[PDB]
C-alpha cells in the first residue's frame, strides 16, 4: 500500500503552492480578455508537420434548469436528438458528440426499432459518441463521490446495455469548478482521458502561459502515479463557440453559423457571420486558422481540440445543414492550400485524445504532473462562485437523506433473489434515477428555476418513496421465520421513522407508536446497520405514553430514557420563540446494537407506572416572564428560570458550558483537562447595493458578517442520562446542541423567513492557532488543505463543506462534519464557518433570470468534535491533504449512514425473529461497504452481486488497533462460484480472483467486486 501521509509528491503543478504563489491580477488582455495578445510563428507548421484540427460538434442539455427535463426534452432535446439521428445518418463524415444519458435513454425507448437500429449503426461506426456517459455532467462541488458513481454507472450500465459502448473520454464542460474526485473515479472505472472548463481565469492564463492545460491529474496524497488521469482544460472563458475556435470571440462568433438572424441569434461583437462561398472562403479561412494556431500556442501538440456547440444546440435541421455546409466549405478550402498547413475535420473527443496521445508516443510532447482542485471558480472579476455551496439548502440535505435510503435500499434487498412481482428492481431504478439526475450541476448545486426545484424535489420523494418499500419489503423477509414468510408486495409491513429528515419545524413526518391497555401492550422496531461493523446508536421514537420500556428479543431490558415531545413555535401574539411540549406524545431512546450489514429487533412495551429499566429526563425552560408548560403524564414537572449560563456533562463524555443565550462557549474533553474556548455565533452576510449582486451562484456580500441580534431568547435543556441537550429559539434558527455521551451533535432548524437579501452563517471561534490553514473535503472522499488569502475576496475564501472541516494547530483540532453540503470558511485564526441559507432578491446575471425567494425551513445536522492532536502522526507541513481521526469520522458516517429504524405496521409480527447478520465480518473501522447491489434479475441461472469497497484514511494518535476481521464481500452470499475484481461500474473484470476471495483495499483506495453464485 502507498504511505498517503508521510511523502509528499512531486508534481508540476500543485494547485495550493500555485495559489501561494500566483497574483491574480485582473488586467485588460485585449482580446482575449483574460489573456494576452497570443503571437506564434507561421513557419512552426509545414508540410512535414502539420496542425491536425477536430472540430466537434456538442450540444450541452441541462437535464433541469430553466426548464423541467421533461419540458427541455418535449421542446428541445427530442428535437435535437431526432435530427442528430437523421443528419449523421444521411451525412457520413458529420460527427456528433453526447454526454447526457438520462435524455438519451429517455429518447431511445420511445424510438421505433427501425431507428433503435439506425442509431445503433452511428454509434458502432463512430459518428455519434458517448462522453462520459453518466446519468447527467454532475455537479463536483456538493456531490458526493457516492452519488457521483451512481450517476456514471446508471448511464454507463444503460449504454453498456443498449448501444454496446462504454466511453472511456469524459466532457465536463459546465460544473462551477471542478474536482479531482471526477479523474479518481473515472480512472477507476476505464476512463483514459478528461476534458474540464470551468477554471478560475487566472488559472486558465497561467497555466496557458506555461502550456500546461493538459496534465496527468493525480490524486493529492498519491506519490507514485497510479491515479493520473490526463486531463484537458480548455482556455477561454466559455464553451461556447465565440469562446472555442481561438482567443477573439469577434471573429470566433463569425463561425457560429447559426447567428446570421434567422434563428434569433446574434453576435455581441457586432460582426455577423457570412456565409461561406467560393468568393470569401479564402479570406474566412485565413481569419480562422488564424485563431486556430493561436488556441494551439497554448498546448503542447500539434493536435488541436475546437468544441462546436453550445446550449441546447443542433435542433433545427436548418442549424445542422449550416453548421456542417459552412464547415465542409471551410474544410476543403483549407485542407486542399498547403501553405496553410492543416488537416481539419470533424471529430470526435476520443478521436482528439487518441492522436493527442500518437504525438505524446512519438515524443512530439511531455505533459506535467498536477495535484489539487479548481475550486473555487470565478468566471471574471470578482464573481466567485461560492454561493452555490449554500442555494436551496434544503434539496442539499435531502440529496444526502436520499443518498443513504438508496444505499440501504439497495443493501438490504441484495441478499435475496426476488420475484419479479415484488417490483424491487422497478423500485431501485426509479430510485437510483432520480438521485442520479439531481446530481445534475443545476440540480443539487440549487442553481434551477423555482418550478423546476419542485420537480427535482417531488422526483426525490418518490425515489424515498421506493427506497422505504423496498427496505422494508427486505427487513420483513429477513428477520420472518422462512416457513412461515407470506408476502403481499404491495402492503407495508414497517414504516420508516427517521428523526432528522425532514425533521421538527421541517415536518411532523413522524409517526406514534400507539400503545395501551385497551388497544396494544407493545410494539416491535426493527433497526438496520448499513456500516459493515458491529454498531450502536442512540435510537428514538414517539410513543402514546410515557410508561414505555425496551426489550431485545430474548426478553433483555434496555435501558431507555423518556423525553417530551417539544416543538417550537414562533408565537405571532407574545413576538417570541418559544417550545410547547405535547402531552399525549413522548419520545424513548435508547441504544440499539446492530450487527455488521444487519438487523436488530427490539420491542417497545406499555406498562400503568415507570418502567424499572427507564428514566425521565429533567427539563429546565430559562426565560423571563415564564408560564407553565404542563406534560400530561410525564413524571417530571418542568423548571423555570431566568436565563443563565449552564453546563453539561452526559456519561463520561466531554462538559459543555453554554452562554445565557443557549450558545456553546466551551469544551471540556476531561474532568482534569481545561474548558477549551469553543463559541458558536450566528451572523448574517448581506448584497451590494452598488455593483454586481449575489444570487443563487455567485456570493458577493458587502463586507464581512455582522452578528445577528439575539434578543433575549427562551432557552430549553433537556437532562437525561442517555441524552441531555440545550435548544434555543434565535431568530431564523432554532439551534441544538444535543449529547450523548462523545462528541456533540448540532441540529440547525433554519427558517430564513422573509429576510430578504440575507446569507445566514454559523460560525465557531476558537483559540485554535491555524493561521491561514483549514481543511475541508472533496465530496466525502478527502480532505484538502485549504489556505485563506487576503490577496482574494472574501467569497473567493468560501469553499465546498460537502461533509467537513476542520482547523487545526499543533496541539488542538476542531472538527465540524456535516449531513448536508453548504459553503463555508476560516476567515480568521480559529474559527470556521457555515453558511446555513441564503435568499436573494436579484439575479446574478448566469442565466437562471430569477433570485433565490424560495427558501422553506431545513434541519441541518452537525458532529463537533474537539481533538487533542499532538500526538497524531500528521502528514508535513508540504503536503496539500489531511485526514480525520477515528472519531470524527465515525462521527460523519452517523450523519450521512445513521442505523435505519422500522416500526411494525400491524398489530402482530409471527415468525418474527431478533436478528440478521450476526455472522457478517465487523471489519475495520477505516473501510465500508459503499455499494451492495445485485447486479441479476431472479431468472438468471448464475447471480451476480457487485460491492464497492472504499478504505478511508485514518489518523495515527496512540490509540491501539482493535484485532478486527477480514471482511470478504465475495463470500458474504453463499454457494460463491466466483470472484472478479471490476471498475467501479461493474461493467469490465478486470482479475479473476484466487480462492473466490476479495482482498480487502488500502488507504484511500475504492475498488469493486462481483461474486457469482449458482442459483
Ligand atoms: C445574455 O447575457 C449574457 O449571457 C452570458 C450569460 O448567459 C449566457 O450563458 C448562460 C449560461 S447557461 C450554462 O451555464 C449556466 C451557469 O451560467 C449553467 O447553470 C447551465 O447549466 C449552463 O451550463 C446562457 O443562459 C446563455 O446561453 C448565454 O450563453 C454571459 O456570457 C454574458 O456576460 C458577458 O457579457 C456581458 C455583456 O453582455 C459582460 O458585461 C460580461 O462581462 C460578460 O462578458 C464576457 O466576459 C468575458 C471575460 O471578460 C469575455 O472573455 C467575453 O468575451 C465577454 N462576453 C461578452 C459578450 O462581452 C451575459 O451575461
Ligand atoms: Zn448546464
Same mark, same amino acid.
Given at each position: 500500500?502507498?504511505?498517503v501521509?508521510?511523502d509528499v509528491?512531486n508534481?508540476d503543478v500543485?494547485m495550493?503552492?500555485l495559489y501561494?504563489?500566483?497574483?491574480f491580477?485582473?488586467?485588460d488582455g485585449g482580446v482575449w480578455?483574460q489573456?494576452?495578445?497570443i503571437?506564434?510563428?507561421p513557419?512552426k507548421?509545414?508540410?512535414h508537420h502539420?496542425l491536425?484540427?477536430?472540430?466537434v460538434?456538442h450540444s450541452?442539455?441541462?437535464?433541469?434548469?430553466?426548464q423541467?427535463?421533461?419540458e427541455?426534452?418535449?421542446?428541445?432535446t427530442?428535437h435535437?436528438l431526432?435530427?442528430?439521428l437523421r443528419?449523421?445518418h444521411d451525412?457520413?463524415?458529420?460527427?456528433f458528440i453526447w454526454?447526457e444519458?438520462?435524455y438519451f435513454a429517455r429518447?431511445?425507448?420511445?424510438?421505433?426499432?427501425?431507428?433503435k437500429?439506425?442509431?445503433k449503426?452511428?454509434?458502432?461506426?463512430?459518428?455519434?459518441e458517448?462522453?462520459?456517459?453518466?446519468?447527467?455532467?454532475?455537479?463536483?462541488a456538493?456531490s458526493?463521490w457516492?452519488?457521483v458513481?451512481?450517476?456514471l454507472?446508471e448511464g454507463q450500465?444503460?449504454?453498456?446495455?443498449?448501444?454496446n459502448?462504454?466511453?472511456?473520454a469524459?466532457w465536463a464542460?459546465?460544473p462551477?469548478?471542478?474536482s479531482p474526485?471526477?479523474?479518481?473515479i473515472?480512472q477507476?472505472?476505464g476512463?483514459?482521458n478528461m476534458?474540464?472548463?470551468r477554471?478560475?481565469?487566472?488559472?486558465?492564463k497561467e497555466l496557458?502561459?506555461?502550456?500546461?492545460?493538459?496534465?496527468?491529474?493525480?490524486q493529492?496524497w498519491? *506519490?507514485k502515479?497510479?491515479t493520473?488521469?490526463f486531463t484537458?482544460?480548455?482556455?477561454?472563458y466559455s464553451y461556447?463557440?465565440?469562446?472555442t475556435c481561438?482567443?477573439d470571440?469577434?471573429?470566433?462568433?463569425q463561425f457560429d453559423?447559426?447567428?446570421?438572424?434567422?434563428?434569433?441569434?446574434?453576435?455581441?461583437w457586432?460582426?455577423p457571420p457570412?456565409?461561406?462561398?467560393?468568393?470569401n472562403?479564402?479570406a474566412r479561412?485565413?481569419l480562422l486558422?488564424?485563431?486556430?494556431?493561436?488556441?494551439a500556442?497554448?498546448?503542447?501538440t500539434n493536435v488541436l481540440?475546437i468544441p462546436?456547440?453550445?446550449?441546447?444546440? =443542433?435542433?433545427?435541421?436548418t442549424?445542422?445543414?449550416v453548421?456542417?455546409?459552412?464547415y465542409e466549405?471551410? =474544410?476543403e478550402?483549407?485542407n486542399?492550400?498547403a501553405?496553410? *498547413?492543416?488537416?481539419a475535420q470533424?471529430?470526435?473527443?476520443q478521436?482528439?485524445?487518441?492522436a493527442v496521445?500518437?504525438?505524446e508516443?512519438a515524443?512530439?510532447?511531455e505533459?506535467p504532473?498536477?495535484?489539487?482542485?479548481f475550486?473555487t471558480?470565478?468566471?471574471?472579476?470578482d464573481?466567485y462562485?461560492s454561493g452555490?455551496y449554500?442555494?436551496?439548502?434544503?434539496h442539499?440535505?435531502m440529496?444526502?437523506?436520499?443518498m443513504?435510503?438508496?444505499r440501504?435500499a439497495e443493501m438490504?434487498?441484495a441478499?435475496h433473489s426476488?420475484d419479479?412481482?415484488a417490483?424491487?428492481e422497478?423500485?431501485?431504478?426509479?430510485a437510483?434515477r432520480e438521485?442520479?439526475?439531481?446530481?445534475?450541476?443545476?440540480?443539487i448545486?440549487?442553481t434551477?428555476?423555482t418550478?423546476?426545484?419542485?420537480?427535482?424535489?417531488?422526483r426525490?420523494?418518490?425515489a424515498?418513496?421506493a427506497?422505504?418499500?423496498?427496505?422494508?419489503?427486505?427487513?420483513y423477509?429477513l428477520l420472518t421465520?422462512p416457513?412461515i414468510?407470506?408476502?403481499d408486495?404491495?402492503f407495508?409491513?414497517?414504516?420508516?421513522?427517521?428523526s432528522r429528515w425532514?425533521?421538527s419545524?421541517?415536518?411532523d413526518?413522524?409517526? +406514534?407508536?400507539?400503545?395501551?391497555?385497551?388497544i396494544?401492550?407493545?410494539?416491535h422496531?426493527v433497526?438496520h446497520?448499513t456500516?459493515?461493523?458491529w454498531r450502536?446508536q442512540?435510537?428514538?421514537?414517539?410513543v402514546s405514553?410515557? =410508561?414505555?420500556?425496551?426489550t431485545?428479543?430474548?426478553?433483555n431490558?434496555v435501558?431507555?430514557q423518556?423525553?417530551?415531545?417539544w416543538?417550537?413555535?414562533?408565537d405571532?401574539?407574545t413576538?417570541?420563540i418559544?417550545?410547547?411540549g405535547s402531552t399525549?406524545?413522548?419520545?424513548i431512546?435508547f441504544?440499539?446494537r446492530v450487527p455488521?450489514?444487519?438487523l436488530?429487533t427490539?420491542?417497545?412495551?406499555?406498562s400503568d407506572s415507570?418502567?424499572e429499566?427507564?428514566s425521565?429526563?429533567?427539563?429546565?425552560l430559562l426565560?423571563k416572564?415564564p +408560564?407553565?408548560?404542563?406534560?400530561?403524564?410525564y413524571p417530571?414537572d418542568?423548571?423555570?428560570?431566568?436565563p443563565?449560563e449552564?453546563?453539561?456533562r452526559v456519561?463520561n463524555?466531554?462538559?459543555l458550558a453554554?452562554?445565557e443565550?443557549?450558545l456553546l462557549?466551551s469544551i471540556?474533553?476531561?474532568?482534569d483537562?481545561?474548558?477549551?474556548p469553543?463559541?458558536?455565533?450566528?451572523?448574517?452576510?448581506?448584497v451590494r447595493?452598488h455593483?454586481?449582486?449575489?444570487?443563487?451562484?455567485?456570493?458577493?456580500?458587502?463586507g464581512?458578517?455582522?452578528?445577528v441580534?439575539?434578543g433575549q431568547?427562551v432557552?430549553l435543556v433537556?437532562?437525561?442520562?442517555?441524552?441531555?441537550?440545550?435548544?434555543?429559539?434565535?431568530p431564523?434558527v432554532?439551534?441544538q +446542541?444535543?449529547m450523548?455521551?462523545g462528541?456533540?451533535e448540532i441540529? *440547525?432548524?433554519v427558517?430564513i423567513?422573509?429576510?430578504?437579501?440575507?446569507?445566514?452563517?454559523?460560525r465557531?471561534?476558537?483559540h485554535?492557532?491555524?493561521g491561514?490553514?483549514?481543511? +475541508?473535503?472533496?465530496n466525502?472522499?478527502?480532505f484538502?488543505?485549504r489556505?485563506?488569502?487576503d490577496?482574494?475576496?472574501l467569497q473567493?475564501?468560501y469553499?465546498?463543506?460537502p461533509?467537513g472541516?476542520?482547523?487545526?494547530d499543533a496541539?488542538?483540532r476542531?472538527?465540524?462534519?456535516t449531513?448536508?453540503?453548504?459553503?463555508?470558511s476560516?476567515?480568521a485564526?480559529?474559527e470556521l464557518?457555515?453558511?446555513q441559507?441564503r435568499?436573494?432578491?436579484?439575479?446574478?446575471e448566469?442565466?437562471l433570470?430569477?433570485?433565490?425567494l424560495?427558501?422553506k425551513p431545513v434541519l441541518?445536522?452537525?458532529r463537533?468534535?474537539?481533538e487533542?492532536?499532538?500526538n497524531?502522526?500528521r502528514?508535513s507541513?508540504?503536503?496539500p491533504?489531511?485526514?480525520?481521526?477515528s472519531?470524527?469520522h465515525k462521527?460523519?458516517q452517523?450523519?450521512?449512514?445513521?442505523?435505519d429504524?422500522f416500526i411494525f405496521?400491524? *398489530?402482530?409480527?409471527?415468525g418474527?425473529?431478533?436478528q440478521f447478520?450476526?455472522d457478517?465480518?465487523?471489519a475495520?473501522?477505516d473501510?465500508?461497504?459503499?455499494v451492495?447491489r445485485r447486479?441479476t434479475?431472479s431468472?438468471?441461472?448464475t447471480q451476480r452481486?457487485?460491492?464497492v469497497?472504499?478504505?478511508?484514511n485514518?489518523?495515527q494518535?496512540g490509540?491501539?488497533?482493535?484485532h478486527?476481521?477480514?471482511?470478504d464481500?465475495?463470500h458474504?452470499?453463499?454457494?460463491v462460484?466466483?470472484?472478479?475484481?471490476t471498475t467501479?461500474?461493474?461493467l469490465?473484470?478486470?482479475?479473476?480472483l484466487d480462492?473466490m476471495?476479495?482482498?480487502?483495499?488500502?488507504?484511500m483506495?475504492?475498488?469493486?467486486?462481483?461474486?457469482?453464485?449458482?442459483?
Amino acid at each position: 500500500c502507498q504511505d498517503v501521509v508521510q511523502d509528499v509528491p512531486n508534481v508540476d503543478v500543485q494547485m495550493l503552492e500555485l495559489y501561494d504563489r500566483m497574483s491574480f491580477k485582473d488586467i485588460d488582455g485585449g482580446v482575449w480578455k483574460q489573456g494576452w495578445n497570443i503571437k506564434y510563428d507561421p513557419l512552426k507548421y509545414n508540410a512535414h508537420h502539420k496542425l491536425k484540427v477536430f472540430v466537434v460538434p456538442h450540444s450541452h442539455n441541462d437535464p433541469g434548469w430553466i426548464q423541467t427535463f421533461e419540458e427541455y426534452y418535449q421542446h428541445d432535446t427530442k428535437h435535437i436528438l431526432s435530427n442528430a439521428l437523421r443528419h449523421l445518418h444521411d451525412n457520413p463524415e458529420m460527427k456528433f458528440i453526447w454526454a447526457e444519458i438520462s435524455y438519451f435513454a429517455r429518447f431511445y425507448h420511445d424510438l421505433g426499432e427501425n431507428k433503435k437500429l439506425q442509431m445503433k449503426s452511428i454509434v458502432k461506426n463512430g459518428q455519434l459518441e458517448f462522453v462520459t456517459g453518466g446519468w447527467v455532467m454532475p455537479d463536483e462541488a456538493n456531490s458526493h463521490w457516492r452519488n457521483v458513481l451512481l450517476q456514471l454507472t446508471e448511464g454507463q450500465t444503460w449504454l453498456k446495455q443498449f448501444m454496446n459502448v462504454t466511453p472511456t473520454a469524459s466532457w465536463a464542460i459546465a460544473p462551477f469548478g471542478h474536482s479531482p474526485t471526477m479523474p479518481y473515479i473515472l480512472q477507476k472505472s476505464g476512463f483514459k482521458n478528461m476534458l474540464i472548463q470551468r477554471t478560475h481565469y487566472s488559472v486558465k492564463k497561467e497555466l496557458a502561459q506555461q502550456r500546461q492545460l493538459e496534465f496527468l491529474w493525480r490524486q493529492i496524497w498519491d *506519490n507514485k502515479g497510479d491515479t493520473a488521469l490526463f486531463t484537458h482544460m480548455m482556455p477561454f472563458y466559455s464553451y461556447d463557440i465565440p469562446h472555442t475556435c481561438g482567443p477573439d470571440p469577434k471573429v470566433c462568433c463569425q463561425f457560429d453559423f447559426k447567428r446570421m438572424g434567422s434563428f434569433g441569434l446574434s453576435c455581441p461583437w457586432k460582426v455577423p457571420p457570412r456565409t461561406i462561398s467560393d468568393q470569401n472562403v479564402a479570406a474566412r479561412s485565413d481569419l480562422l486558422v488564424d485563431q486556430w494556431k493561436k488556441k494551439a500556442e497554448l498546448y503542447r501538440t500539434n493536435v488541436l481540440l475546437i468544441p462546436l456547440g453550445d446550449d441546447f444546440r =443542433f435542433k433545427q435541421n436548418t442549424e445542422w445543414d449550416v453548421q456542417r455546409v459552412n464547415y465542409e466549405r471551410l =474544410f476543403e478550402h483549407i485542407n486542399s492550400q498547403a501553405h496553410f *498547413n492543416v488537416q481539419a475535420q470533424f471529430g470526435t473527443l476520443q478521436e482528439y485524445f487518441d492522436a493527442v496521445h500518437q504525438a505524446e508516443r512519438a515524443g512530439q510532447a511531455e505533459f506535467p504532473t498536477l495535484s489539487g482542485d479548481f475550486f473555487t471558480y470565478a468566471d471574471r472579476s470578482d464573481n466567485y462562485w461560492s454561493g452555490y455551496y449554500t442555494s436551496r439548502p434544503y434539496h442539499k440535505r435531502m440529496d444526502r437523506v436520499l443518498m443513504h435510503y438508496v444505499r440501504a435500499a439497495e443493501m438490504l434487498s441484495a441478499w435475496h433473489s426476488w420475484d419479479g412481482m415484488a417490483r424491487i428492481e422497478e423500485r431501485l431504478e426509479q430510485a437510483r434515477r432520480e438521485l442520479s439526475l439531481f446530481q445534475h450541476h443545476d440540480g443539487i448545486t440549487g442553481t434551477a428555476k423555482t418550478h423546476v426545484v419542485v420537480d427535482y424535489e417531488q422526483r426525490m420523494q418518490e425515489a424515498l418513496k421506493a427506497c422505504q418499500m423496498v427496505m422494508q419489503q427486505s427487513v420483513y423477509r429477513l428477520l420472518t421465520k422462512p416457513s412461515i414468510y407470506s408476502p403481499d408486495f404491495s402492503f407495508s409491513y414497517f414504516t420508516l421513522d427517521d428523526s432528522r429528515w425532514p425533521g421538527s419545524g421541517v415536518e411532523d413526518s413522524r409517526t +406514534t407508536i400507539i400503545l395501551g391497555e385497551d388497544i396494544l401492550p407493545s410494539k416491535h422496531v426493527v433497526m438496520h446497520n448499513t456500516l459493515p461493523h458491529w454498531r450502536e446508536q442512540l435510537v428514538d421514537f414517539y410513543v402514546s405514553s410515557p =410508561f414505555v420500556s425496551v426489550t431485545d428479543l430474548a426478553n433483555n431490558p434496555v435501558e431507555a430514557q423518556v423525553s417530551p415531545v417539544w416543538s417550537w413555535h414562533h408565537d405571532t401574539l407574545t413576538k417570541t420563540i418559544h417550545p410547547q411540549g405535547s402531552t399525549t406524545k413522548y419520545r424513548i431512546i435508547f441504544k440499539a446494537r446492530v450487527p455488521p450489514m444487519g438487523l436488530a429487533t427490539y420491542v417497545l412495551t406499555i406498562s400503568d407506572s415507570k418502567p424499572e429499566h427507564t428514566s425521565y429526563a429533567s427539563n429546565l425552560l430559562l426565560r423571563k416572564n415564564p +408560564t407553565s408548560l404542563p406534560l400530561g403524564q410525564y413524571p417530571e414537572d418542568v423548571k423555570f428560570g431566568d436565563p443563565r449560563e449552564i453546563s453539561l456533562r452526559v456519561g463520561n463524555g466531554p462538559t459543555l458550558a453554554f452562554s445565557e443565550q443557549g450558545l456553546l462557549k466551551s469544551i471540556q474533553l476531561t474532568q482534569d483537562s481545561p474548558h477549551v474556548p469553543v463559541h458558536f455565533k450566528f451572523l448574517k452576510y448581506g448584497v451590494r447595493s452598488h455593483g454586481d449582486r449575489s444570487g443563487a451562484y455567485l456570493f458577493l456580500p458587502n463586507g464581512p458578517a455582522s452578528p445577528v441580534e439575539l434578543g433575549q431568547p427562551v432557552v430549553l435543556v433537556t437532562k437525561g442520562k442517555l441524552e441531555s441537550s440545550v435548544s434555543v429559539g434565535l431568530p431564523s434558527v432554532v439551534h441544538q +446542541t444535543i449529547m450523548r455521551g462523545g462528541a456533540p451533535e448540532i441540529r *440547525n432548524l433554519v427558517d430564513i423567513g422573509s429576510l430578504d437579501n440575507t446569507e445566514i452563517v454559523m460560525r465557531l471561534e476558537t483559540h485554535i492557532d491555524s493561521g491561514d490553514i483549514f481543511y +475541508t473535503d472533496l465530496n466525502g472522499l478527502q480532505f484538502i488543505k485549504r489556505r485563506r488569502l487576503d490577496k482574494l475576496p472574501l467569497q473567493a475564501n468560501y469553499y465546498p463543506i460537502p461533509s467537513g472541516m476542520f482547523i487545526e494547530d499543533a496541539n488542538t483540532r476542531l472538527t465540524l462534519l456535516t449531513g448536508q453540503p453548504l459553503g463555508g470558511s476560516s476567515l480568521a485564526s480559529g474559527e470556521l464557518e457555515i453558511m446555513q441559507d441564503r435568499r436573494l432578491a436579484s439575479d446574478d446575471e448566469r442565466g437562471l433570470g430569477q433570485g433565490v425567494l424560495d427558501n422553506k425551513p431545513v434541519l441541518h445536522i452537525y458532529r463537533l468534535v474537539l481533538e487533542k492532536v499532538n500526538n497524531c502522526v500528521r502528514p508535513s507541513k508540504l503536503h496539500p491533504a489531511g485526514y480525520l481521526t477515528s472519531a470524527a469520522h465515525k462521527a460523519s458516517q452517523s450523519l450521512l449512514d445513521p442505523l435505519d429504524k422500522f416500526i411494525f405496521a400491524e *398489530n402482530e409480527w409471527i415468525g418474527a425473529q431478533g436478528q440478521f447478520g450476526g455472522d457478517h465480518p465487523s471489519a475495520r473501522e477505516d473501510l465500508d461497504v459503499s455499494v451492495m447491489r445485485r447486479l441479476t434479475k431472479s431468472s438468471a441461472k448464475t447471480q451476480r452481486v457487485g460491492y464497492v469497497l472504499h478504505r478511508t484514511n485514518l489518523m495515527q494518535c496512540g490509540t491501539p488497533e482493535e484485532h478486527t476481521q477480514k471482511l470478504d464481500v465475495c463470500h458474504l452470499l453463499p454457494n460463491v462460484a466466483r470472484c472478479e475484481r471490476t471498475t467501479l461500474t461493474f461493467l469490465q473484470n478486470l482479475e479473476h480472483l484466487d480462492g473466490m476471495v476479495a482482498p480487502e483495499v488500502c488507504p484511500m483506495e475504492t475498488a469493486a467486486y462481483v461474486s457469482s453464485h449458482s442459483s
